[PDB]
Symmetry: C5
Subunit: 256 residues, 5 copies
């Protein structure tokens, strides 16, 4: 039972943080990148290394200790460091003779969510015979049905650097206490289009004027910002990701 909002000086707070991307980090110099992508020799033998798999990011933010619950009302969010994609002068492959290096481009996924509990995930796999690596949490006992929808694959985004992007999505049958937004833009040559502004606000209230209600006084933020692939001189490609800023305004809400 959701009752009234509490007012007065004491009754609002705000959360401000950033989530780093988790692209795989194949060595000590390559934070924000994946390992270069290799292609299996057969469909059955698909078997990606952990460092080659971008994962969902998540942070659990503790809120001032409070029945009253913190209610998330608005979000401002922004991808951090968009201009880094203008470095086309290192380690790259020329577009044509004497040209600059091919920039980061191709498949992107940009995703973020704000909830009063962990994001709920449904497992779907491109190829059910893919062997996901040790160190990742992935759909277990995958069958051919898992290539389209196997309802056995439920999980919570409850751990950072763990849930690979390619085999999990937000579960649309759950997540009543979360708001989520994502865009997959495919193709090998698609250009990144990245907007920044400190003037845009998303309102998190549902159809009844109620935002996510924070259980245990924790706010859950989740994100993926795979911007595309970087291409080395050899032609090998590595995913590149960026950090995401969150600012969330919250108010106290009485419940029963």
């Amino acid at each position: 039972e959701v009752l009234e909002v509490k007012t007065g000086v004491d009754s609002i707070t705000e959360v401000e943080c950033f989530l780093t991307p988790e692209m795989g980090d194949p060595d000590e110099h390559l934070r924000g990148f994946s390992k270069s992508i290799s292609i299996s020799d057969t469909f059955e033998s698909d078997s990606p290394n952990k460092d080659m798999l971008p994962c969902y990011s998540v942070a659990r933010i503790p809120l001032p200790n409070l029945i009253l619950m913190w209610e998330a009302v608005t979000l401002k969010t922004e991808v951090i460091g968009v201009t880094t994609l203008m470095n086309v002068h290192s380690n790259g492959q020329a577009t044509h003779d004497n040209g600059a290096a091919k920039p980061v481009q191709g498949t992107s996924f940009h995703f973020f969510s704000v909830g009063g509990e962990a994001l709920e995930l449904q497992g779907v796999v491109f190829n059910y015979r893919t062997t996901y690596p040790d160190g990742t949490i992935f759909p277990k006992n995958a069958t051919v049905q898992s290539q389209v929808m196997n309802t056995e694959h439920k999980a919570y985004l409850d751990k950072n650097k763990a849930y690979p992007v390619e085999c999990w999505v937000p579960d649309p049958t759950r997540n009543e206490n979360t708001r989520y937004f994502g865009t997959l833009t495919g193709g090998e040559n698609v250009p990144p289009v990245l907007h920044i502004t400190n003037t845009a606000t998303t309102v998190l209230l549902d159809e009844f004027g109620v935002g996510p209600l924070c259980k245990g006084d924790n706010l859950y933020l989740s994100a993926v910002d795979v911007c595309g692939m970087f291409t080395n001189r050899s032609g090998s490609q590595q995913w590149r990701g960026l950090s995401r800023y969150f600012k969330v305004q919250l108010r106290k809400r009485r419940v029963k």
Copy 2:
């Protein structure tokens, strides 16, 4: 069509997912078509069944009820969009040492909510195409069938039977259904798939009346051909994904 009932018991909701029906050429390839082959002449076009994506449909029974369930709102979403980030599974490298070419090219994204079966009109790219045993296709195709032959009328009344390429929603009918679709062509067309649990489509017409569910049945239909997967060899297969539906319904009295 009279008034809406109110009160605790007067609303219900349907929540489900429709699986895609892309052809399923073997026991490992659910969600995929058979690789596509090209006829040697225009006249000799003869696609195999496993190579033809078909419309999906589910009839959802509603609480037994003159009142009729009226579909009012819809939330819908393509499920498993991130699978298209698998570019390491024996695809064809974009260039020497590159990652695999992702799923791309021609897509059809379509969904409908009705109080009866979606009504279909048959149109063919090529009237001499021999559609295969086990599909339901425009019968007695003439050259006029390439643009409009009003004989080709059907109901989307069976799963994995109606090929996407030779049927569309009949604009001359479907008064009790709401449909939406986008065909995006070209072989290099990039998929653009959005997800969110914050978007609702209102199903009410210009008089504030939604689809009215005959016999207490809700009809959901879909196609989500996302593009084609290219194998190492160059062969291509349609790839489809599931669609989530959530529909809100209220009891409406009628005479």
Copy 3:
């Protein structure tokens, strides 16, 4: 026409529902919806396209119930019919690469429709004034080099089906007071078709003063072009492909003085 009040009553409304088939050239008895394959002249002076190679405007004059009262067109629902046919990539087209599917229909499109109370009015404009348009078409007569940009002599009525080639006529913006027209040319040879369908969208046909097209002689004029792109054969030869268009129009009786 001084326009006066709308008439009411069960008797006072009617609707028109039909489809216009595309007129792409139809080069033989198996190729309804296609043009002849396209060939290119070696000079501007030798441009002489065959009729079967030229897409034309579609038109239908629809008789309305006989009636001073006039039928006033108020709303339109319209839809391109058969959009999913473009998923046929297995019918002797040209493989995009070794072992791949056939290149789908793509490239230059023109999607156009109008609703009016009289024939659509046309202005002739030509890419190349020395193009000789063929017998059996209606085209800009006495073309001069000024016809490549604007020659006010080239006025016509879309008063005949499969006759007015798309490429040399457009709706005349200096006229057409009693018609509503809408069109998009999307160029480029690799341009992907984007075709939306739905039965929930309505276009209101009333002007800034709340008046829609008034049907002279109790006729409603519907016009369309839906050139979807080009189909590429295995040989590399290319043919325009078109699709039919559905129209549903609501009309009401309007008194005029």
Copy 4:
């Protein structure tokens, strides 16, 4: 001081402006000369018939203190479907294919004002020598490649001001409304919408449209649709005419 609107009180301007693309010979109205490339910045010296220019018409209004105030505009590019001629000495896209359609860099621009469009000069390359019979930035310096405030002009002559070295001056033009889109890239496809159902309101944030000094309305346009490539591969700009219809009303001023 702008005062009340009069309520005889309205008039309408209807016309078209032809494109001015270069017109290299008597058969190529609407096209430019084929484009050639200087081998150095210093040697850039385009011929006039290779340079699209701004189009302008000064339209005299009924003699009238009252001024004509421009309130609404309807506008359209004329002949959009000519771009479907892919059978006329173009270059096949591939063996046995149709000709490459017009595509690549486009500039679509129109303005309505109560005086000549005010122009600022900016040049890609300050060492470009602009030809006789054109009006161009004079005394160009390297600063002219980004902003040289010396280059002020009025769009006061047709077939004269090259598109490439002039833009509307955003520091002036209070008495004009202008709108333009430059869509670059060599392969970019043209997207041309036509309809007779769209109106643009010309009033500013205070409810005042352009006021016609000396009872003249100034219409300006550029519609470079792209480049046509012929069978040899050479490329030439292709432009189209623009329709304007403008509603005006009489306004008293002090």
Copy 5:
């Protein structure tokens, strides 16, 4: 605390100017261009020449001396010289035999801000081993974490032609007293799309009806307009920038 707006003919003022782009200016004939872009063999050896790095533009505009503050309320802005990109006859590379020159295209960054103090910057680098050149102001003591987010890299955009675009962005964790807008459009061949009009106004008021308040009676304007790359006959590529016009309206506001 923000109190009432002043009224009267004397209560408003306006600022009108342009910011020139700062692309590198490799010689006396190439204002508005960078130096040719080259590609270092490794991240380790990445060492961009100063003339090769586009920088942020900034101007500090003094306002009429004024407790009252000037409050920025509206902005009109425009890229100046968009039609220059139609010069495809000047020292370029023909797209195909006998064709015109390939126009300016590829990665673009269009950005502008209006504030009552210097734009606040956060350093993010594509590659932490990039050696930024003498004469630039850049993230100091970069580590591998600087490739995603390192909170030590805080700066003010307080100097023209000094802060490279590629290693700095607006700090979303600050800039309360500034409004900023930017778009990074990536890709090797992405076409420029440039709109111009004198009929569009951006409102600078925040959600409480308050615009940027000008400390010390100074308005801060910042911009980047990297339009793409110019490809010369050899195929070497240079960034090309254009100037940006600003018109800002301000009003007097009382504060305590």
